[PDB]
Symmetry: C3
Subunit: 264 residues, 3 copies
């Protein structure tokens, strides 16, 4: 088996091309680069520069105004390296220019994430309980980190995670070995998460990955709604060590009352 991380054009997938290859990739690797999805180094520059400007030239007062009262990294500024997070609502923006630039950037990320997830579902003949569109109108989280192992091995609990980033620190398990994941100015890196594995009945792999040890990274988590419902027996069938009584359960029943993005 070739341990090369493949690349797929979103447009070609939506045209019904490379279906066998796509299904194979999802099952055996669970990761791939995605082109023709409206996201490149171009649509990233604007957002990157303005947030970097904020991280470097923003005053403690300005940063305070966009910092949540609890340091959860859900919205606004966070000092972990620095981070800026946002979602579909309840956002914290430092300026009008910043808001316009980041709202557009977030929208493009959310659109691309839903589109590729839509293809993952179609290629596996998966109809989520409640329908595809209700499943995809969810609870995304975008996190931009600035770093002027650096992250332990783990897998994502998202449906899919889109990464842009800017030495190759990011590595993922492929074929049984850690493969480097360099940036592609013309594409976005896609990691399938445990929810893709769960909703498709085990047809999709959620690969482990980590960051080895100055750069920036944009991570977009497409996460299901709390009421997303699934089959308990089926979950057991593909590796989930669930402690759920009954035949069906929700994302909330499984993970709890607070979103958990990664797992070791």
């Amino acid at each position: 088996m070739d341990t090369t991380v493949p690349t797929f054009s979103l447009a070609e997938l939506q045209q019904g091309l490379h279906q066998d290859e796509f299904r194979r990739c999802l099952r055996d690797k669970g990761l791939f680069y995605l082109t023709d999805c409206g996201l490149t180094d171009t649509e990233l520059k604007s957002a990157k520069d303005i947030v970097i400007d904020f991280f470097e030239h923003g005053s403690e007062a300005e940063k305070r105004a966009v910092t949540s009262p609890v340091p959860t990294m859900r919205r606004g500024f966070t000092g972990l390296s620095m981070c800026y997070s946002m979602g579909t609502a309840d956002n914290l923006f430092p300026s009008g220019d910043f808001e316009r630039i980041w709202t557009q950037y977030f929208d493009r990320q959310y659109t691309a994430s839903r589109a590729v997830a839509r293809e993952v579902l179609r290629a596996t003949g998966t109809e989520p309980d409640g329908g595809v569109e209700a499943f995809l109108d969810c609870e995304p989280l975008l996190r931009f980190r600035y770093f002027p192992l650096r992250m332990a091995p783990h897998y994502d609990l998202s449906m899919v995670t889109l990464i842009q980033q800017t030495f190759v620190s990011l590595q993922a398990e492929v074929g049984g070995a850690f493969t480097d994941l360099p940036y592609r100015p013309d594409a976005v890196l896609v990691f399938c998460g445990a929810i893709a594995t769960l909703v498709t009945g085990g047809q999709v792999k959620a690969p482990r990955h980590h960051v080895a040890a100055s750069q920036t990274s944009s991570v977009f988590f497409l996460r299901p709604n709390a009421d997303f419902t699934f089959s308990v027996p089926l979950a057991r069938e593909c590796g989930f060590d669930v402690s759920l009584d009954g035949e069906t359960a929700t994302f909330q029943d499984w993970i709890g009352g607070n979103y958990v993005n990664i797992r070791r």
Copy 2:
């Protein structure tokens, strides 16, 4: 903005003084020293000496008699450095003298914690679902540690946490930088926790803190009851990344079936 950790007299607060300054502190810093609350180095000496005596001169048999069958550090003796924990009931005391001394010490800590939390609620015009007194008649946990980073950065999930302690190891984020928190023989240190943030609708900050690397520390967590109820949309509004279906939820729905005191 001045990054000085302020001090407030509990008596003066209860008199309606320094309200604007108190509200400001709660919002921008989330920590402060508290005087005139019935807790000083005097009321600590008795408890400290007797527990230290136990840690140093107690036999393995005597320690066994006050050690829980599961090493949870909820009640009795624990060997992590050593620790002694207690609550409102189901306690484990090694001697009659010990029980009298620590029951009085616990009562003073619980009274002071409820009193300052009462002021936090009043200064923010907060009426918890179910009322103030039902909210404050809760599930406190007192932990005394003896140490004859030493603790990773985190925030507390309590309403408020009171610390006495005895080189300055304790540090908290203030103004965007770690500020030392030395002991005050005449005051107790108060950290606001995530529940203060939650119940007040985001009017209170839960500051991150840690312990840098021989001394003793008394930590009192004022924790809500499992059935404490709050608004889900409001929680989302102040930074909580909740995965809760519906409009209202309980502490148990959010955190789960076991108390969690801190979060990184």
Copy 3:
């Protein structure tokens, strides 16, 4: 008190012998070696050799065929050192010979685990809610690790955990000090877990242990069903820091929707 890790013959226990000594051990130590339970170095050789052969001579393709889409270590092969896991159903076997050998090995482990747990319940006069047999027909997990501190201090959340293994790395807290736990070709090592503490009302200790830093170890967790029910007030009485509203709760209510095997 003697800090020696005792040994009990399962057959002698089932005959009503050494009851006081057994109860004492369960209360003060929570661990012991078990002989005459159908498990020795003999019944381990076959399984060990064949899995070692797989770990060393198995191709990436063969390992892939028995690897779950999510890296949970619940079933099949896992590359953490390597590991092979199995349960009562939904298993992944690389060959017919492997399946026959490991199914028999698993059955012997499950039978021995239920038998000793049955004795733990009898010696403490414990009748689980719903009855003994329903409690023991549960959700076991067997994990075989190959290692051609190595594990932080923790306690198990199982009813009981059986260990075989093959310098003494394994250590447990006994009498207030870490005692080495060498292998016994004629016996299996038994650690009592938090569920034994819980179901017996605090009559059984769940000892902390860890692995100091090439060998193999077989760990069998006898875990309760999600619907196992217990008394909340009683749980509080023996050290469990539960945040459960009401008088009764289930394992799922306490731990959540995913099994958790250990706790620090």
